[PDB]
């Protein structure tokens, strides 16, 4: 995957609308990210790091 | 729809017994109820195929028609109206994030052909003045969401219109739809007329006295409706 596909997906993921890529939707634990990317940070870190922004939303 | 035109006749002979002096108390033609379109509500490329994009601008075309009842080429409004709940089909083959956000632009259309149902079969002679203003002062509210999806239009001519951008101008006419067919939908279900239909509309306007957002709705269809009583 790409981070251009993460921008346009996590920009859902602020409304709250389940993403492509995202799939979780805070039903255990919170918002995750799973890929092939295997970027460390961009992929996990930086996606994580703004969806709570989203969980926020959720609550 | 075949059920109502019973109840129409039942109330109409109530009030000719009770009233002999003023004689031949009005009725509309059959048309009037049996003609679908005068009521609100009534080549395709495979969509799987396209970029995501370009998916947007079609949806987005699709719900522009939605929201003024007619039905859209990748969204169907479904026909059985059962009970008085609308639904709504979308394609199945979308992107799940558009799907849903479209699940959720959706319940304007539903709380519109209601409203517009509500306005137009409670709009006949036999149920009443105060059952007629109602309608009749929900049905400008009704034309001024059309202005507002005229606008609309125009800015998605000029491309300059998304998903997004969307679900953000349609909240403030949402909450409007939404109480006027949660109010549409308990004057039908009691029965209600005359008074028993300006009661509902005072316990309404209590339940949201610090919203005002609602409540001046609310106030304004109260005001209106309650010229004939």
């Known amino acids: ?59 | 729809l075949q059920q109502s035109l019973e109840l129409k006749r039942k109330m109409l002979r109530d009030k000719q017994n009770k009233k002999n002096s003023g004689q031949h108390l009005p009725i509309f033609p059959a048309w009037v109820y049996e003609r679908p379109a005068l009521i609100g509500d009534f080549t395709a490329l495979p969509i799987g195929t396209l970029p995501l994009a370009s998916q947007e601008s079609a949806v987005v075309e699709d719900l522009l028609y939605v929201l003024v009842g007619v039905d859209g080429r990748y969204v169907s409004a479904q026909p059985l109206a059962g009970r008085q709940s609308r639904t709504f089909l979308v394609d199945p083959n979308l992107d799940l994030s558009i799907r849903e956000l479209v699940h959720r632009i959706l319940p304007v259309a539903a709380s519109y052909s209601a409203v517009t149902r509500f306005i137009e079969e409670k709009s006949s002679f036999e149920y009443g003045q105060v059952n007629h203003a109602l309608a009749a002062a929900m049905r400008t509210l009704v034309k001024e969401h059309l202005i507002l999806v005229s606008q609309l239009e125009q800015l998605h001519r000029q491309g300059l219109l998304s998903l997004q951008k969307l679900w953000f101008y349609i909240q403030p006419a949402m909450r409007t739809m939404d109480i006027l067919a949660s109010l549409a939908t308990s004057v039908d279900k009691g029965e209600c007329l005359g008074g028993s239909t300006l009661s509902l509309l005072h316990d309404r306007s209590f339940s949201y006295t610090g919203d005002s957002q609602a409540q001046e709705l609310c106030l304004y269809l109260t005001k209106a409706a309650s010229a004939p009583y």
């Open chain 1, 1 to 59: 995957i790409t981070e251009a596909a993460l921008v346009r997906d996590i920009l859902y993921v602020f409304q709250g609308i389940d993403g492509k890529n995202i799939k979780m939707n805070n039903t255990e634990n919170c918002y995750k990210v799973e890929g092939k990317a295997n970027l460390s940070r961009s992929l996990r870190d930086t996606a994580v790091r703004l969806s709570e922004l989203g969980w926020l939303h959720n609550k």
